Amino acid sequence: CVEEVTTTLEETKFLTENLLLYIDINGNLHPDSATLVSDIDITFLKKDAPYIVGDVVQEGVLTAVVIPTKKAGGTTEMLAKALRKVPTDNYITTYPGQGCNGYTVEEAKTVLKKCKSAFYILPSIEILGTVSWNLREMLAHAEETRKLMPVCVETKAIVSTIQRKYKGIKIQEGVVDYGARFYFYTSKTTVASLINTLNDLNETLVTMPLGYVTHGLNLEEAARCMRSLKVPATVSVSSPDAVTAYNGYLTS
Ligand SMILES: [Li+]
């Protein structure tokens, strides 16, 4: 009932056209699902928001289910309960509950072995060492390695430091390659959208944990989100004790 495939989305459609996508209660796509809806109208996902966990929406070849997140009380049984609402069918999908939602692959496997449906699981397509580097250190590293450095534009202390270092830089949201290569973002976009952007750019990162403070996440919550990155990243945390903490959060 559950089979992992080695193929891309397009290379897996010969088995079924149906895609199972994961959304949150506002109808926003999980980063694992967000890359699967090219050239398809997805207005229907958010049109009927807000949802509750377990709600299912469908249009054409797409099915989407609202899954729980452990930051908001979610457990393994609530994940299983949510997936039971999906109509029985054959689907291409990803393992439910990964990334920010905080479930492990082994937990996702457990949920899907209930298998009213058949699922073909797309491949999740390298872990650089976690460090505790200050902003000056992170900038110098970026400059010489050409790694992409995400920066939250609302963090005034960082923006001013960059302006001093790189006289003449015009900081604006998006990629800015001046002195070093930056991805400037607002906390007024989702963490998922930022992760998908970084994954699409397909560059190695030097970064603080994404969502941590800027999007109200604690360190464990950010570490869960960081699992959705598909690019290598040097992750710089607040202190040496946080290195130990972060690495533990990432592996559970
Ligand atoms: Li973005």
Author numbering: 417 to 541, 548 to 674
Sentences from the paper on this structure:
Among all SARS-CoV-2 encoded proteins, the nonstructural protein 3 (nsp3) is the largest, and it participates in many essential steps in the virus life cycle. In addition to the CoV-conserved domains of nsp3, SARS-CoV-2 nsp3 harbors a “SARS-Unique Domain” (SUD), which was first identified in the SARS-CoV genome. SUD contains three subdomains; there are two macrodomains, Mac2 and Mac3, that are followed by a frataxin-like Domain Preceding Ubl2 and PL2pro (DPUP). SUD-core does not possess enzymatic activity; rather, it functions as a binding module for viral and host molecules.
We expressed a nsp3 fragment (residue 413–676) comprising SUD-N and SUD-M domains, denoted SARS-CoV-2 SUD-core. Although this fragment was highly soluble, it failed to crystalize despite considerable efforts. We reasoned that the lack of disulfide bond between SUD-N and SUD-M might confer high flexibility and prevented the crystallization. Therefore, we engineered a disulfide bond in SARS-CoV-2 SUD-core based on SARS-CoV SUD-core; the resulting mutant containing double mutations L516C-Y647C was denoted SARS-CoV-2 SUD-core-CC. To crystalize SARS-CoV-2 SUD-core-CC, we avoided using reducing reagents in latter stages of purification to promote disulfide bond formation. The protein was finally exchanged into an oxidative buffer and incubated overnight before crystallization screening. Initial SUD crystals diffracted to ~ 2.3 Å, and the crystals were gradually improved by optimizing crystallization conditions. SUD-core-CC comprises tandem SUD-N and SUD-M macrodomains connected by a flexible loop region. Both SUD-N and SUD-M adopt the typical ‘macro fold’, a mixed six-stranded β-plane is sandwiched by short α-helices and connecting loops on both sides. We clearly observed the engineered disulfide bond between L561C and Y647C, tethering SUD-N and SUD-M together. (2) We did not observe the SARS-CoV SUD-like dimers in the crystal structure of SARS-CoV-2 SUD-core-CC, and PISA software did not identify any other quaternary structures larger than monomers, consistent with the results of size-exclusion chromatography and analytical ultracentrifugation, demonstrating that the SARS-CoV-2 SUD-core formed monodispersed monomers in solution.
